[PDB]
Write a protein that binds this ligand. Structure first.
Ligand SMILES: C/C=C/Cn1c(Cc2cc(OC)c(OC)c(OC)c2)nc2c(N)ncnc21
Length: 210
């Protein structure tokens, strides 16, 4: 059963700005999504020190980046803490409102879009290159969910009965037609080396088969 929700007006405004503003330095999306994965990995690692059972859902802490030219998708998979249903519908957005406001104000005062991560809303930089984002996520003590948005003011959340991911998050970027450069491991490697070379988890960059 698919439930459809409206973004808060401010977040919809932010998404529209990211989609409609002329800004050529789009590659920064990858640094932001990798940093989100790293943060999530940091969180489950820290929690596991006082409750080792939190790793019963998977011991390995890693990030995989998988380009699929045929599906026109770039997928970032982490085995971090994951997100709950409450995160997806309510709590991440509640937190994001103030960061969104501060970022929008910063842009008006001369900041550029590449500073988005400092405001906690770097996730939304995905829409620099993606027409649709699907997030499959699994947190301990909650079910696996699929979140989806093609912007336009709404997102959906549904229980996901696809392949279990155990714990963590799969961010599936359905790329815009003119952003297919990010479907080549060569380009992805260049971006990772430039912006994400010191991330403290193994990042495996898959090669496209075709
Ligand atoms: C500061 C927000 C952290 C939530 N988060 C995001 C970014 C993110 C995902 C989101 O939903 C999937 C968000 O709400 C739509 C959101 O709003 C700022 C941010 N990636 C991940 C991830 N890989 N693993 C665990 N949590 C994550």
């Amino acid at each position: 059963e698919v439930e459809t929700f409206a973004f808060q007006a401010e977040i919809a405004q932010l998404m529209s700005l990211i989609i409609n503003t002329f800004y050529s330095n789009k590659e920064i999306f990858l640094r932001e999504l990798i940093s989100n994965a790293s943060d999530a990995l940091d969180k489950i690692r820290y929690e596991s020190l006082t409750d080792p059972s939190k790793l019963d859902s998977g011991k390995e802490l890693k990030i995989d980046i998988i380009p699929n030219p045929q599906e026109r998708t770039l997928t970032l998979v982490d085995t971090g803490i994951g997100m709950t249903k409450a995160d997806l519908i309510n709590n991440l957005g509640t937190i994001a409102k103030s960061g969104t406001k501060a970022f929008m104000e910063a842009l008006q005062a001369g900041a550029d879009i590449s500073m988005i991560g400092q405001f906690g809303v770097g996730f939304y930089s995905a829409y620099l290159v993606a027409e649709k984002v699907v997030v499959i996520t699994k947190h301990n003590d909650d079910e696996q969910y699929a979140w989806e948005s093609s912007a336009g003011g709404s997102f959906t959340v549904r229980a996901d009965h696809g392949e279990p991911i155990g714990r963590g998050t799969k961010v599936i970027l359905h790329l815009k037609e003119d952003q297919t450069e990010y479907l080549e491991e060569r380009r992805v490697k260049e971006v990772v080396k430039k912006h994400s070379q010191f991330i403290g988890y193994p990042i495996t960059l898959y090669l496209e088969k075709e």
